[PDB]
C-alpha cells in the first residue's frame, strides 16, 4: 500500500495473508467470507505469462495477522487449503477479466476479536454504494513504493472513479467486471495498492446497516500511485452468482 497508514488492531479482521511456503514469502492478500471460505484474485494463483501456477498444497493462509513477519501467539491462525476454485472464464491471456478465485479451508477457522468474516453485497447495497466519488478501503502487506515492505498491515481509503476516466487512463480493455479507484491528479491526496496487495479486499461500510461489505478485489495497476493512473478492482457484486454457485455446490 502506497501513501497509507498502519491499520489499527482489529480494523480488518477478514484480512487473510496468502503465504508461499518455499520460498517463504508473502504471495498475496485475500479475505475471509465465512468460516471455511477465502476470496482472492485468480491471478494470485494462476498467471501463465509469468510462470505462476499454484495448487492447494503450495500455499498456506494466515488469518488474524497484523505484523507482516512476527508470529502472533494466541492471535493468528494458520490454515491449509482443501481446494482452489478459479473462475472458469478468468482471462489471464489478456486483461485479467474475472480476476476472482475461492479457496476452501480444510478445517473451519475459529472467529475471535481478530478473525471475523466480511459481508458480500446485496443488490441494494451495491446500487447505493458503487458511485463515483464514494470511498472504499484497501488493506494489505504489499510494498510501500513502486520502486520497501511494511512492518504491519497497511490501510488506505480511495474514491471510486467514473468509468470514462478509468478507461481514458489505460491502454488495456476495461470490462464490466472491473472498476477503478484512486485520486485524480487535481485532488491532491494520494494512495494506491502495490505489489503484494493483490487479492486483498476493497471494502465499504454501509451507512444503512453499519456492516462492512467487500465490493472489490485488488486486481492490477500500472506502477503504484502514479499521477493519472488508477488501480483496478474486480467487481465482486457482478460475479456474486458464481461465488454462490461454488459455495452452494461445494461448501
Amino acid at each position: 500500500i502506497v501513501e497509507g497508514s498502519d491499520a489499527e488492531i482489529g480494523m480488518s479482521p477478514w484480512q487473510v495473508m496468502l503465504f508461499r511456503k518455499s520460498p517463504q514469502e508473502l504471495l498475496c492478500g485475500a479475505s475471509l467470507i465465512s468460516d471455511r471460505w477465502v476470496l482472492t484474485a485468480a491471478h494470485c494463483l494462476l498467471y501463465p505469462p509469468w510462470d505462476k501456477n499454484f495448487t492447494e498444497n503450495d500455499l498456506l493462509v494466515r488469518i488474524g495477522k497484523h505484523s507482516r513477519t512476527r508470529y502472533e501467539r494466541n492471535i493468528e491462525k494458520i490454515s491449509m487449503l482443501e481446494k482452489i476454485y478459479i473462475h472458469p472464464r478468468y482471462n489471464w491471456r489478456e486483461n485479467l477479466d474475472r480476476d476472482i478465485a475461492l479457496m476452501k479451508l480444510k478445517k473451519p477457522v475459529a472467529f475471535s476479536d481478530y478473525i471475523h468474516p466480511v459481508c458480500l453485497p446485496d443488490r441494494e447495497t451495491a446500487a447505493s454504494l458503487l458511485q463515483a466519488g464514494y470511498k472504499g478501503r484497501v488493506t494489505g502487506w504489499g510494498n510501500l513504493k513502486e520502486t520497501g515492505q511494511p512492518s504491519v498491515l497497511q490501510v488506505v481509503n480511495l474514491p471510486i472513479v467514473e468509468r470514462p476516466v478509468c478507461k481514458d487512463s489505460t491502454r488495456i480493455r476495461i470490462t464490466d467486471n472491473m472498476f477503478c479507484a484512486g485520486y485524480k491528479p487535481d485532488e491532491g491526496k494520494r494512495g494506491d495498492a502495490c505489489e503484494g496487495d493483490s487479492g486483498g479486499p476493497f471494502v465499504m461500510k454501509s451507512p444503512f446497516n453499519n456492516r462492512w461489505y467487500q465490493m472489490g478485489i485488488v486486481s492490477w495497476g500500472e506502477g503504484c500511485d502514479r499521477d493519472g493512473k488508477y488501480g483496478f478492482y474486480t467487481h465482486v457484486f457482478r460475479l456474486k452468482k458464481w461465488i454462490q454457485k461454488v459455495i452452494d455446490q461445494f461448501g
Binding site: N95, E222, L239
Partner: peptide
C-alpha cells in the same frame, strides 16, 4: 453520483495483454 460499475450479473454468451505494459503491477 454516477455509477462506478454496473448493477447486473456476469453471464455466458481482444486487446493488449497486461504483461506487455512497462511497470504493470499485478
Amino acid at each position: 453520483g454516477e455509477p462506478g460499475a454496473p448493477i447486473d450479473y456476469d453471464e455466458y454468451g481482444g486487446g493488449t495483454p497486461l504483461h506487455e505494459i512497462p511497470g504493470i503491477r499485478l
